[PDB]
Amino acid sequence: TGRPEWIWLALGTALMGLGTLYFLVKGMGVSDPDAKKFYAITTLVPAIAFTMYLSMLLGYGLTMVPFGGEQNPIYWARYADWLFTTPLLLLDLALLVDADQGTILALVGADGIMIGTGLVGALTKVYSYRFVWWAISTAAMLYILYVLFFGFTSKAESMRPEVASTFKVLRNVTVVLWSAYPVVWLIGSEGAGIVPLNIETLLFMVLDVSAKVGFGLILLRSRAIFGEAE
Amino acid sequence: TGRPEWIWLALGTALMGLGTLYFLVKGMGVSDPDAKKFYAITTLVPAIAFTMYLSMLLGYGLTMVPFGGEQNPIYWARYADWLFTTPLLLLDLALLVDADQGTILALVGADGIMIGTGLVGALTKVYSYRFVWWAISTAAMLYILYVLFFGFTSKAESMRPEVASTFKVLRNVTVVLWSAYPVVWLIGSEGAGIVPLNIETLLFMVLDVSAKVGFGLILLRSRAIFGEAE
Amino acid sequence: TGRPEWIWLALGTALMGLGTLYFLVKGMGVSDPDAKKFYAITTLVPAIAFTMYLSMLLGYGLTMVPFGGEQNPIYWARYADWLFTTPLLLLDLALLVDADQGTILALVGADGIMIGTGLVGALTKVYSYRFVWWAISTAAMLYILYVLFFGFTSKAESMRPEVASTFKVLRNVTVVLWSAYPVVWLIGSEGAGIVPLNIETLLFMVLDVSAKVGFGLILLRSRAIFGEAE
Ligand SMILES: CC(C)CCC[C@@H](C)CCC[C@@H](C)CCC[C@@H](C)CCO[C@@H](CO)COCC[C@@H](C)CCC[C@H](C)CCC[C@@H](C)CCCC(C)C
Ligand SMILES: CC(C)CCC[C@@H](C)CCC[C@@H](C)CCC[C@@H](C)CCO[C@@H](CO)COCC[C@@H](C)CCC[C@H](C)CCC[C@@H](C)CCCC(C)C
Ligand SMILES: CC(C)CCC[C@@H](C)CCC[C@@H](C)CCC[C@@H](C)CCO[C@@H](CO)COCC[C@@H](C)CCC[C@H](C)CCC[C@@H](C)CCCC(C)C
Ligand SMILES: CC(C)CCC[C@@H](C)CCC[C@H](C)CCC[C@@H](C)CCO[C@@H](CO)COCC[C@H](C)CCC[C@@H](C)CCC[C@@H](C)CCCC(C)C
Ligand SMILES: CC(C)CCC[C@@H](C)CCC[C@H](C)CCC[C@@H](C)CCO[C@@H](CO)COCC[C@H](C)CCC[C@@H](C)CCC[C@@H](C)CCCC(C)C
Ligand SMILES: CC(C)CCC[C@@H](C)CCC[C@H](C)CCC[C@@H](C)CCO[C@@H](CO)COCC[C@H](C)CCC[C@@H](C)CCC[C@@H](C)CCCC(C)C
Ligand SMILES: *C/C=C(C)/C=C/C=C(C)/C=C/C1=C(C)CCCC1(C)C
Ligand SMILES: *C/C=C(C)/C=C/C=C(C)/C=C/C1=C(C)CCCC1(C)C
Ligand SMILES: *C/C=C(C)/C=C/C=C(C)/C=C/C1=C(C)CCCC1(C)C
Known about the structure:
By secondary structure, chain A is mainly alpha-helical. Chain A has seven helices and two strands. Chain A has a two-stranded antiparallel ribbon with strand order 1-2. The longest helix of chain A is centred in the C-terminal third of the chain and has 27 residues, at 161-187. The N and C termini of chain A lie far apart (55 Å). The interface between A and B is medium-sized, with 21 and 20 residues. One retinal binds at residues 82, 85-86, 89, 114-115, 118, 121, 134, 137-138, 141, 178, 181-182, 185, 208, 211-212 of chain B. The PDB classes it as proton transport.
């Protein structure tokens, strides 16, 4: 309770934990192989986030980085979360549209570059260089957003309407929520330091629960996750 | 030789190295694609363990963690081993039964959570919180054990008898040996400290060689690893 | 500019960045799923290397390792690069020949052992033991080279001539360039220290740009990356 942001770390831990349990229960019983892949992906995402929220809450996932002459509290565990959960979210989208394997590779690899350069920026001790990593990471994010909108152009032919509809909704959820993360980091504790860590943590908690549990609720309620069967 | 547990680290290095060489030789010549996947998986497992045993033996894979007011010797290299070798062992089981891809994802991701939360527990400086990570990791292990027993329920129909027989044996080997690891950690150097590090290292060496080389000997001697062919 | 090797780190950053941009543009428009996988793999390789070259240039990817009684500058970011880019290069080769999945596993796992034991050697504080890790890593490299020459022996039957021709060329490029890396490390800053870090950095920059951008130019100009189509 000693860090003011504890309350949002606690709330994020609880909501990710409850979302995980909900999705775990919800997928109990499903047999359809296509649906099993979406439940597995979609349940792992908040499970991983639960563990990394808890590590921040307990202090394990926090480190001090000197930059600006100051000792700056940097929650590194966010990058260990996102390293796994953001490619998993992209895989859910990619599987929905039956993406080609080359496209999945491009997406997962650009996402790794996005998170790994964000982690390097988050831990860089020369203040000005932190924003160079932010820019490179943002370029990788823009590439991902580009592929999500313009990289499935051969798939439209042979896409079930309900898959098309659930994919468009989740793609729009993804583009809006993910695009807010570079802005929060830029103005927050890792970047310019104009928004305090307390509020930054709240913002990422709202984004994360929305991008993982809210995304997952929309996907897992959809018929698009089942193969078409008589 | 300065740490009493060196002898078990040396013995573990040698047995993993010899098991690797044996499996490498044994799979020389196999053409069958199914069998090649099992030899590859099963040979990599003790090869990786050989390197991490050697890193503990040479001291690289040891760190001191303050907790309990004391400086506690924690062999972190075990988690770098298990991060790769325990999903590989699960993949051998999963391939045997032709598991659905969603099930393999669930298994590999729960296993990553199990090892990563065990690593966080192993390095946590607040003593009481180490057991919170142990509990979460144990929950993930129990999920894996649950899936190995109740998650292949559509596969029984179309399973060759020899695959069914080798899978049941290896599944039983896996459930018994893996379940001992949380107990050893709980009573050993990472947990309550009731069993000294010397004996703990012996116990994990016996478990590891059994779970990797003993498992691999049973699998690789089986006809279940070959596709059925005239 | 304070470290004499900065100029090769700068040149390597620029050439990897320009190679990435070139391959990104070059693959704009390709529809063929086979070709998309090769463009994705082959574009990610210099993109990742660009980020790790930049991290060395900016100092983030450098650490000091005590060994020999001295504080030795070790660029660890090379291992974070190679951890991802060397399996990706192997995947390009493997996909060219339609390798069996067991063979791809063997290659990617031996490559992980090669890079992870090279990283352990690079950070080991007992000088003599650094060469033990070098030897183990070299054994893994020799295994990979062995598989590239003798592990596709069932694939020769059903291999298009242009795939066979591009694969032989890239395989020869790979064996020659990769084999130089253990020699550079052995005589350079990480090993015996007979070649200064400045020259070592130049050597790895020439190898890396050749093994990534030069390799990629040969592959991506080939018809072998397209499925055979009327
Ligand atoms: C899915 C859910 C039930 C998760 C609920 C949210 C939760 C994890 C975080 C909320 C913290 C909350 C209790 C706030 C008040 C603090 C308080 C207790 C007293 C203050 O008092 C103080 C004074 O400084 C702090 O106490 C010590 C530390 C604790 C407060 C933190 C404990 C860790 C957690 C509560 C989480 C435990 C994880 C488990 C789910 C493990 C089981 C795994 C498995 C079976 C799948
Ligand atoms: C597959 C096998 C042959 C492995 C055999 C077991 C072994 C790796 C560990 C046993 C240690 C043992 C010799 C005990 C006595 C110590 C002693 C030498 C003297 C004591 O004297 C002392 C005094 O404190 C310590 O010596 C210095 C360190 C060494 C003892 C340790 C050296 C490392 C290893 C012996 C392993 C080397 C790895 C290789 C396989 C590399 C090749 C890779 C490739 C070709 C695939
Ligand atoms: C693809 C290319 C355009 C890459 C070009 C090469 C380059 C990255 C490295 C060359 C350094 C060079 C300018 C040498 C002179 C130094 C100098 C400026 C003055 C010396 O003056 C000094 C005194 O000590 C140092 O300056 C401070 C640091 C900088 C010199 C380094 C800045 C980082 C880089 C220049 C790279 C930026 C990365 C971007 C591509 C981000 C955008 C991502 C996205 C849109 C895809
Ligand atoms: C968020 C992101 C930036 C992260 C992206 C990925 C990331 C984790 C990068 C990792 C690269 C690298 C380790 C960097 C080190 C930095 C540093 C300063 C020191 C680190 O930290 C230290 C300091 O004490 C220890 O590291 C050395 C040991 C290793 C970390 C573990 C060794 C592993 C092996 C030798 C075993 C072989 C593994 C394989 C077989 C894997 C293949 C799987 C297969 C079987 C299919
Ligand atoms: C046992 C477990 C807990 C481990 C589970 C996974 C694990 C390794 C978690 C890693 C997350 C994270 C790095 C945590 C950092 C903690 C910390 C305090 C600081 C670390 O350690 C430090 C301290 O000096 C350095 O880290 C920063 C640099 C990075 C480690 C490496 C950067 C990688 C990239 C920028 C390149 C892009 C990579 C991708 C392209 C990968 C995608 C593959 C593709 C091409 C298909
Ligand atoms: C170049 C090579 C040697 C590297 C090869 C791989 C490598 C990165 C090895 C990593 C092992 C290990 C982390 C070693 C730690 C060393 C040390 C001294 C301390 C480190 O560094 C520290 C010091 O502060 C922090 O580490 C602990 C936290 C973790 C690093 C991150 C935890 C991750 C999780 C708990 C979440 C679960 C992840 C999974 C779900 C992944 C599965 C994917 C799925 C969903 C499909
Ligand atoms: C589950 C959490 C999700 C969906 C997180 C998304 C994170 C991002 C899109 C992060 C992007 C970043 C940048 C583009 C620039 C650097 C800072 C980051 C890593 C916050
Ligand atoms: C090759 C080595 C094998 C099979 C290792 C298995 C390791 C485990 C099943 C570890 C489990 C753990 C817990 C469930 C709780 C926390 C402590 C661990 C990581 C030892
Ligand atoms: C893109 C960069 C490439 C192709 C790098 C290749 C790196 C190697 C083949 C590294 C090999 C090493 C050894 C065999 C011994 C230990 C030192 C290393 C890691 C340099």
